[PDB]
Enzyme design. Structure first.
Site, PDB file in Angstrom:
ATOM      1  N   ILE A 160       0.819  -1.186   0.000  1.00 29.43           N
ATOM      2  CA  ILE A 160       0.000   0.000   0.000  1.00 29.43           C
ATOM      3  C   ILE A 160       0.876   1.268   0.000  1.00 29.43           C
ATOM      4  O   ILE A 160       0.460   2.312  -0.462  1.00 29.43           O
ATOM      5  CB  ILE A 160      -0.855  -0.048   1.312  1.00 29.43           C
ATOM      6  N   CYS A 161       2.073   1.212   0.582  1.00 28.60           N
ATOM      7  CA  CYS A 161       2.821   2.472   0.725  1.00 28.60           C
ATOM      8  C   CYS A 161       3.363   3.055  -0.569  1.00 28.60           C
ATOM      9  O   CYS A 161       3.664   4.254  -0.576  1.00 28.60           O
ATOM     10  CB  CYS A 161       3.907   2.335   1.811  1.00 28.60           C
ATOM     11  N   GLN A 162       3.523   2.254  -1.643  1.00 28.91           N
ATOM     12  CA  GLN A 162       3.828   2.816  -2.964  1.00 28.91           C
ATOM     13  C   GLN A 162       2.732   3.825  -3.357  1.00 28.91           C
ATOM     14  O   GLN A 162       3.037   4.929  -3.755  1.00 28.91           O
ATOM     15  CB  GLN A 162       3.949   1.794  -4.105  1.00 28.91           C
TER      16      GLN A 162
END
Length: 157
Positions: free
Chosen positions: A49-51
């Site tokens: 998710i952090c991309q």
């Protein structure tokens, strides 16, 4: 050193000095008196998710890096890892290495996953006094909202 008991609004933000992707030292105290600081913890470069979260930060970066505000992304990766990812991704904001001791700053903020050895997706705004003014941890599955970060920052003067 708090594992994943997230620090609450009103707490003094723990100080740190960490290397960024270009090996420069970044110290939180250096902003005191001058800017509000957004801290975006993230678990692993190149995945998750952090991309998408960091891409939203990128896509709105002038709103977070200006005369009033700075934004720092923090994870357990060392600088060479963050350099490559930042270059491919178009990230020009500091990505800082909570690398050795491993996860020490993430632990001090109460946003470390002790089982997996990575930071959870916690986010803080630190004011010009060094005090936490906004705090969140997102539970697995839900993505953070960059509009809420900008609103928290706008409130701080």
């Amino acid at each position: 050193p708090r594992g994943s008991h997230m620090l609450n609004v009103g707490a003094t933000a723990p100080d740190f000095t960490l290397r960024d992707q270009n090996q420069q030292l970044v110290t939180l105290r250096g902003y005191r008196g001058a800017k509000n600081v957004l801290l975006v913890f993230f678990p692993l470069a190149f995945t998750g998710i952090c991309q998408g979260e960091l891409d939203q930060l990128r896509d709105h970066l002038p709103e977070f890096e200006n005369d009033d505000s700075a934004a720092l992304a923090i994870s357990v990766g060392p600088p060479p890892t963050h350099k490559i990812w930042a270059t491919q991704s178009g990230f020009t904001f500091p990505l800082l290495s909570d690398f050795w001791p491993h996860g020490a700053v993430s632990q001090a903020y109460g946003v470390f996953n002790e089982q997996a050895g990575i930071a959870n997706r916690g986010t803080f705004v630190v004011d010009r006094s060094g005090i936490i003014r906004f705090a969140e941890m997102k539970q697995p599955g839900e993505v953070r909202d960059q509009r809420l970060w900008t609103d928290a920052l706008a409130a701080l003067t």
